[PDB]
């Protein structure tokens, strides 16, 4: 069991793939920064956080690539101790900065979709800049153990030198703490906050869709009433009209519920005349449902149509694509970080799994490095596709 090894293909596939990731990601992130700063100026909170995310990805692609040559030939590190520190702190820095910026992006989307008026505009841009400052400071301070403790280490008598984490205690709790904060504060709490924000967004999106869908049933049957004269089809049109009005009243406080109370009152009045064999009066009475639509329900319908239009924004699709891809690229790393942190504690004592975890950690860092390269490709949706004009120009 102690004798093993899978570096026959890792030492050749990763360096070329790492170089491809480096070039593609650096070009894409430079383009994203250039467009977000000039083609669509920083006039929104989302653009400020997305520019910061692109800058963090650029910093990761600029300070890690020494890992590409670190793994290109064995695990030798013929660089400076400072270079080892700044290349080993970059994984933690990028993880924390990107995850905090993504949580703030989700919070901003939640506020912009479900609290359109509770959040101001002048006081948010300054708040966004201050939050970005605090996020970068927090990411830098959470990468301080990898600066203090990471050091260059000559292996035995031979000249091979590695960038090793120096724990000045055999029974040291720093490896457990660093590997657990990377799992809890780096993954768990941000993931829970993002899930709550997106579920609350979906809850408001469902309520907005319910009001408009139920009003559509009210609208279609209203036209059916006017374009019909048999004293019977009017009844079925109002039957579907009454149920839609009752369902729409359940969306939502007193003014909204009151506004739908007269609406169902007019529907019943139309059914009273329809049941009496009168069509003109039934058709005439159904016309007042438009007058009460403007008085009470129109102001609530527009707030629902606007909310549904926010889902169709490019910035919403890009942010949720970035959030989803970040948690898919980093979940191999957090799973094996948790697997490794269990081995140190002695929770799992099995030689076979330990070799698997050791050979998987370099790949998990590789996958997380791939996330920075594929992030600017999500921006190629619409509106931001004007970068093609900039490239040709």
């Amino acid at each position, epitope marked *: 069991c102690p*004798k093993a090894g899978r570096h026959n293909y890792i030492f050749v596939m990763i360096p070329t793939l790492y170089s491809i990731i480096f070039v593609v990601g650096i070009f894409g992130n430079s383009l994203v920064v250039i467009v977000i700063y000039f083609y669509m100026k920083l006039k929104t909170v989302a653009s400020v956080f997305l520019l910061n995310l692109a800058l963090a990805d650029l910093c990761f692609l600029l300070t890690l690539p020494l890992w590409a040559v670190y793994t290109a030939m064995e*695990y030798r590190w013929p660089f400076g101790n400072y270079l080892c520190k700044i290349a080993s702190a970059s994984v933690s820095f990028n993880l924390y900065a990107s995850v905090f910026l993504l949580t703030c992006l989700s919070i901003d989307r939640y506020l912009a979709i479900v609290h359109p008026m509770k959040s101001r505009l002048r006081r948010t841009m300054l708040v966004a800049k201050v939050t970005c400052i605090i996020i970068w400071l927090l990411a830098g301070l959470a990468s301080l153990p990898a600066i203090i403790h990471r050091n260059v280490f000559f292996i035995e008598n031979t000249n091979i030198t590695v960038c*090793a984490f120096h724990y000045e205690s*055999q*029974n040291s709790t720093l490896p457990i703490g660093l590997g657990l904060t990377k799992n809890i504060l780096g993954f768990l709490f941000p993931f829970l906050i993002i899930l709550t924000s997106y579920t609350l967004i979906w809850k408001a999106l469902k309520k907005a869709y319910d009001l408009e869908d139920n009003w559509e049933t009210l609208n279609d049957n209203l036209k059916v009433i006017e374009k019909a004269d048999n004293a019977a089809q009017v009844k079925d049109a109002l039957t579907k009209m009454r149920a839609a009005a009752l369902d729409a009243q359940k969306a939502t406080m007193k003014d909204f519920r009151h506004g739908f109370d007269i609406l169902v009152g007019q529907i019943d009045d139309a059914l009273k005349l329809a049941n009496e064999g009168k069509v003109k009066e039934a058709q005439a009475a159904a016309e007042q449902l438009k007058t009460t639509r403007n008085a009470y329900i129109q102001k609530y319908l527009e707030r629902a149509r606007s909310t549904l239009d926010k889902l169709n924004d490019d910035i919403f699709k890009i942010i949720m694509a970035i959030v989803l891809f970040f948690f898919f690229s980093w979940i191999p790393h957090q799973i094996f970080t948790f697997l490794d942190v269990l081995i140190q504690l002695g929770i799992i004592r099995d030689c076979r799994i330990a070799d698997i975890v050791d050979t998987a*950690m370099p790949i998990t860092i590789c996958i997380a490095y791939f996330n920075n390269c594929l992030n600017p490709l999500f921006y190629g949706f619409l509106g931001k596709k004007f970068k093609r004009y900039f490239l040709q120009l």
Partner: nanobody
Amino acid sequence: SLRLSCAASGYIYRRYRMGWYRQAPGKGREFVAAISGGSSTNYADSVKGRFTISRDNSKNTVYLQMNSLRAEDTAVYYCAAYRIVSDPRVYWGQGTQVT
């Protein structure tokens, strides 16, 4: 002369390569001896013949047995446990400055 010990943890003992490093004023940490970790015992100059590194698979301890202890061998001995594969980590134990 005297023998040093290194009461390592179970996880460190099973996988990590446990050995001895030496540091004296005016010089950095220089390698002395190593054992375990899947490799063979490695020795440094001026300690290849005299210094002997041993093994104990039950008490979870490695002993560096040195018999001559002449010249400028006196320094602070640090027990290190380094796992080079994947993420390199070194677990330094408490030093022991000999006479």
